[PDB]
Design an enzyme around this catalytic site. Sequence first.
Site, PDB file in Angstrom:
ATOM      1  N   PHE A  13      36.145  54.661  42.657  1.00  0.00           N
ATOM      2  CA  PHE A  13      36.564  54.783  41.277  1.00  0.00           C
ATOM      3  C   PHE A  13      35.505  55.095  40.384  1.00  0.00           C
ATOM      4  O   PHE A  13      34.332  54.358  40.673  1.00  0.00           O
ATOM      5  CB  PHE A  13      37.404  53.444  40.980  1.00  0.00           C
TER       6      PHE A  13
ATOM      7  N   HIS B  93      41.144  48.120  52.356  1.00  0.00           N
ATOM      8  CA  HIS B  93      40.105  48.839  51.671  1.00  0.00           C
ATOM      9  C   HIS B  93      39.016  47.766  51.696  1.00  0.00           C
ATOM     10  O   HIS B  93      39.398  46.854  50.789  1.00  0.00           O
ATOM     11  CB  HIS B  93      40.341  49.443  50.422  1.00  0.00           C
TER      12      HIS B  93
ATOM     13  N   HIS C 212      37.894  58.462  53.799  1.00  0.00           N
ATOM     14  CA  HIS C 212      38.002  57.503  52.722  1.00  0.00           C
ATOM     15  C   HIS C 212      39.304  56.945  52.786  1.00  0.00           C
ATOM     16  O   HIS C 212      39.483  55.802  52.992  1.00  0.00           O
ATOM     17  CB  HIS C 212      37.682  58.003  51.625  1.00  0.00           C
TER      18      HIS C 212
ATOM     19  N   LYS D 118      41.161  52.243  57.392  1.00  0.00           N
ATOM     20  CA  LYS D 118      41.575  51.338  56.210  1.00  0.00           C
ATOM     21  C   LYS D 118      43.283  50.915  56.587  1.00  0.00           C
ATOM     22  O   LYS D 118      43.702  49.866  56.152  1.00  0.00           O
ATOM     23  CB  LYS D 118      41.600  52.033  54.784  1.00  0.00           C
TER      24      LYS D 118
ATOM     25  N   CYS E 182      33.897  51.823  45.653  1.00  0.00           N
ATOM     26  CA  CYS E 182      34.192  52.200  46.852  1.00  0.00           C
ATOM     27  C   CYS E 182      33.221  52.820  47.709  1.00  0.00           C
ATOM     28  O   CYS E 182      33.403  52.724  48.715  1.00  0.00           O
ATOM     29  CB  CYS E 182      35.776  53.049  47.043  1.00  0.00           C
TER      30      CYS E 182
ATOM     31  N   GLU F 191      41.334  64.519  49.446  1.00  0.00           N
ATOM     32  CA  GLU F 191      40.492  64.379  50.328  1.00  0.00           C
ATOM     33  C   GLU F 191      40.842  65.512  51.554  1.00  0.00           C
ATOM     34  O   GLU F 191      39.949  65.969  52.230  1.00  0.00           O
ATOM     35  CB  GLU F 191      40.507  62.886  51.224  1.00  0.00           C
TER      36      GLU F 191
END
Lengths: 408, 408
Positions: A395, A336, A302, A331, A163, A313
């Site tokens: 990830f 995403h 994110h 997103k 990501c 976050e």
Amino acid sequence: KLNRVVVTGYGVTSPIGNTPAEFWNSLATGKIGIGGITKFDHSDFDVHNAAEIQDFPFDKYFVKKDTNRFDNYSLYALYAAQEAVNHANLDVAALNRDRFGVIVASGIGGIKEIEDQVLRLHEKGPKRVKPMTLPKALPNMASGNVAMRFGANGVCKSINTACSSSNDAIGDAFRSIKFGFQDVMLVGGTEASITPFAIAGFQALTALSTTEDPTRASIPFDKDRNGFVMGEGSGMLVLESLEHAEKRGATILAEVVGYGNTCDAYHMTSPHPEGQGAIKAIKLALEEAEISPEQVAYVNAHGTSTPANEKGESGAIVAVLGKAVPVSSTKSFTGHLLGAAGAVEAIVTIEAMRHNFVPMTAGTSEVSDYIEANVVYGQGLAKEIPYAISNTFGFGGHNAVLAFKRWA
Amino acid sequence: KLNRVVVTGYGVTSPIGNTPAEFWNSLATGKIGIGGITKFDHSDFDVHNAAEIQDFPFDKYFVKKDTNRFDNYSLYALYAAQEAVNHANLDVAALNRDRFGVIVASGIGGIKEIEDQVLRLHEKGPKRVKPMTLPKALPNMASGNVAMRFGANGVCKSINTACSSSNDAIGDAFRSIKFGFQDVMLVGGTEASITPFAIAGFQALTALSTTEDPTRASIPFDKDRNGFVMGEGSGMLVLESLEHAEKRGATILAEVVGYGNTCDAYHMTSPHPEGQGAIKAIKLALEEAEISPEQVAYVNAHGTSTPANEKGESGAIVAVLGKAVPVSSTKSFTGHLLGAAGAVEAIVTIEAMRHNFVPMTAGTSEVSDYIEANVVYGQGLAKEIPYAISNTFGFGGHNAVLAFKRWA
């Protein structure tokens, strides 16, 4: 002797628009790109939604025969890069081609080609596997294809941090120009993973929202969030040293000022519970930009819409920047974009700065009570944005943060 | 204030050995690692040879349950990284973890996992796809896995430039340390692609040798060469700033002095026929290292054994360094390790300097009449090697050259 780094143009193909104009308009009018999956038969799946590019302008630059040598993951990048080059009015014939590089990030590459040829191999034998299988599938190919299209003879590579891929790609390009290794770079990311395999893989990991209602599937920071919604597309930017841009009379859109990249070194898919690595990444970016936390006017989160992501976050944003900084995750609009997330998110961030407007987090209607960050939802927020940050926490524990400066 | 960058340790798992001692012994004695394929049923294929790791020391660091979360491409990198750390006598628990980073390149990632899970999905449905599919497969995972094992909280990323991946990885790590962003890095590459899909893919492309005799299948520079032989494995190096290494009393094994990366921007699979990008990449590495062409004492070639590769590579080497510098390709022993090629070849290069010996290009017996480079075959060559270069030129036109200095 370091150079300042500026953005002179960008291109995008995404679930909410194929030009910065349609892209921003969607954000401003709250039109999301998430809907029922149409790319494959998903009746046996738990996941039924995705953010697809249902109107890709294939005909603008490509011919039918082009699919023989390019998987969509390359096609999105080529389109987006051509749009960026046009946007920037960059004349490749006026450049020193050895100082012109390309970085196209991708988390999974030509995954549709892989799945399709693996099945062909098992059904019909090795002789039936297409000669172009690997040139279409290998994740570095998009970067090479982009370089080939524009005659870029400088740096050419792909970066994969899942990501965070395109955040790290932009950070790397930025660093290359800043330290004088290159003068112009076409940089960004691309992903085309709305396939049976990739959806099934993320669904098995239990990372995707299984929410049937497409308007309630991608709701970052919402108490009801239950995973991400996959999107596809590419964002590409043209970065140039300030001197190169000025000398050619380029129109500057924004400046890249800081880049922070850290690793949680914690768990393969769970992010650090107290955003420890993210905190550090944000600080490194501000430190390089030589700005204080209070100077950050907008955070493009994110914000993937998973329970764990937003808890940590928000935690990190608050620890470094506090509770007033407006935060939103697009997103909620685009899904995403994986390896392309950072690139499209950089475009959101720059446009926000250019429009004096924080786009909202769509769908979200009630933030988890423990979430202390200033989440923008319901409607966008008009305000001056002289500096903004864009986060990605992938990830594998890959944290990447880019700090941008509004252009005067 | 720029830093010198030194190598304090390295680890390898390869078709010719799983320790530098075993690996070097194979090279010194002409023992190649190419043999018949055993990893899968190749009865329907036209290619029946590969360089496999048939003695991976799985039990040294792993337990049975570890295969549930790591594809071989990760296991090899973890093994090699631990061996490198041991070799360097690096106590990771004592480091400034924020200044300790990891880069693990890979061209294809956990491709065996992808293939197996694609088939499982089509035969049994999405519900039977393993939860760990993507954590095992995605190409960035090895990097995150290595960082997790060693508590590296600094830079963590994967670079994909196909056959050049690990040369670009080492180059990038070198640049991060040189420019003061990190003090210690575990860097290298890994590949585990001796699978039906990857072999079928390269076979369809016509890039693999169909030569039956395994002793004549990988014969770089040989007039009868006809494609590469796939290998698998991992090479990992510990790089440290010279200050960091001296402060802890480390034993320095070599120094990284230059890195050149360019792009042919020519064709997706064919290298530029006149080796123009290669020439520029070599020159960039020599300029950064501040050494003249005559100072290059050995060239460890990309030398994949394809007709096009060696014609262009020998041409570029001769153009920049002349006809006397000895050149050898160790892909004649190891097969082509793709994304891990540059890392193991860096180990070859360092070991050659440490033993005053240019390992021979095995199998090769008669070089093409047009090849003007001093190709070493038949037997190796004893000589002092104070500086050496290691080339990689991958699919997508990615050229990368590393310059090493003997320690000294």
